[PDB]
Amino acid sequence: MNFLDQLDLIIQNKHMLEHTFYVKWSKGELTKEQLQAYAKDYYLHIKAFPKYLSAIHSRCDDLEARKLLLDNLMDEENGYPNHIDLWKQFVFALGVTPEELEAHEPSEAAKAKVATFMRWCTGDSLAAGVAALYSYESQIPRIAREKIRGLTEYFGFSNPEDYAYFTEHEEADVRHAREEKALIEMLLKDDADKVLEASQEVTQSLYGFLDSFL
Amino acid sequence: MNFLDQLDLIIQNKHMLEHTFYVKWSKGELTKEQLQAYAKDYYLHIKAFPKYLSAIHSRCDDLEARKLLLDNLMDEENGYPNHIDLWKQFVFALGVTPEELEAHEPSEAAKAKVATFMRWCTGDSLAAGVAALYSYESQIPRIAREKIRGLTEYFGFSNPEDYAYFTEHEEADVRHAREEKALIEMLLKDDADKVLEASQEVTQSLYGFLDSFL
Ligand SMILES: [Fe+2]
Ligand SMILES: [Fe+2]
Ligand SMILES: [Fe+2]
Ligand SMILES: [Fe+2]
């Protein structure tokens, strides 16, 4: 079996949309107290995602790979509103005040998720770092689509600008996962084992993060 | 004394334009054999400069600082022709063939320069990493200006597109040094000592690199 296929199968078999939290989201069975906690607890990962990308770029000598990593990073962090600003719009539309979000101390659940990504993105296998990111970003497009639906037919999201982060990631992360899948191939150095090891680790780590809100 | 002033004084007092190699350039007293060797030996630093920036960014939690680091990185590596492509144009206009440049193995002089930057950019002081980069980029604008002159009135540079790298850096690195000087302030964490330690180290390291061609 080809390792990219093995890679996708791992994510297919531990995919956040099958997690209770997002199933609960799908049927609507989630409190406003639970959403505001997740929106706040996600913020640490959202601020850190640029560093995941620059961590790999900064250890990379493939000049064409770096430009691809830069393209993701540029979409993440460049301009107003970058993806960080978009999340904030979602966090504030949920009801959270700016002060409360900035004063929020992230759960150790969330710190473990981030730390799992950073471990791979700073590790010794550039393809494993991209696989860590890929095992998340490739789920994102379908997650966003179903998350807009749940914000509409369940949580009173009238204004579209209130879930713009998810509208952007419905499309942005189709490109990103395609570029990451290509980056994994161009950076492979007889380490497809770490690619899958990273995939297993990130996907489970994401389950523990979702577990935290129950 | 203020440490940014101390910082500039260090660079003023070990500035590449005062080095024999660039004085020799200034009077024209440099062989085509010497320029093609320097153009080739510089290539390792030129390919690595993006990683210097992403190395600091990837360790940084100041969200406004990261966007500044990204702006430099974007000017360095984004688009055709990025700064790497521009150097190539200079390397090829000097007479070097593409194959010979890609087949060139960099001197240990050059490997020491790069390694000095990367040590600081991956070290434990974000302001020292920016100071390592600043102690180089702040010299660049005046270096470029005098290096265009020496390519014109000495080395037969007719076509302007042949020294476009230096035309770009005459202006680009005015902005970059101003943004880096500002980044050093925003990232200082009671470590102005490392800022100057880095400055001393980078500036000397640059002298040893220039020393290599004599
Ligand atoms: Fe994103
Ligand atoms: Fe993304
Ligand atoms: Fe540059
Ligand atoms: Fe620059």
UniProtKB/Swiss-Prot annotation, chains A, B:
CDD domains: TenA_PqqC. It comes from the Bacteria. One of its GO terms (cellular component) is extracellular region. Can complement the PABA-auxotrophic E.coli mutant lacking pabA, pabB and pabC genes. Involved in de novo para-aminobenzoate (PABA) biosynthesis. Acts as a self-sacrificing or 'suicide' enzyme that utilizes its own active site tyrosine residue(s) as the substrate for PABA synthesis. The side chain of the tyrosine residue is released from the protein backbone via cleavage of the C(alpha)-C(beta) bond, leaving a glycine in place of the original tyrosine residue. Reaction requires O(2) and a reduced dimetal cofactor. Was also identified as a specific toxin that associates with death domains of tumor necrosis factor family (TNF) receptors and induces apoptosis in mammalian cell lines through a Caspase-dependent mechanism. Belongs to the CADD family. This is 4-aminobenzoate synthase. It comes from Chlamydia trachomatis serovar D (strain ATCC VR-885 / DSM 19411 / UW-3/Cx).
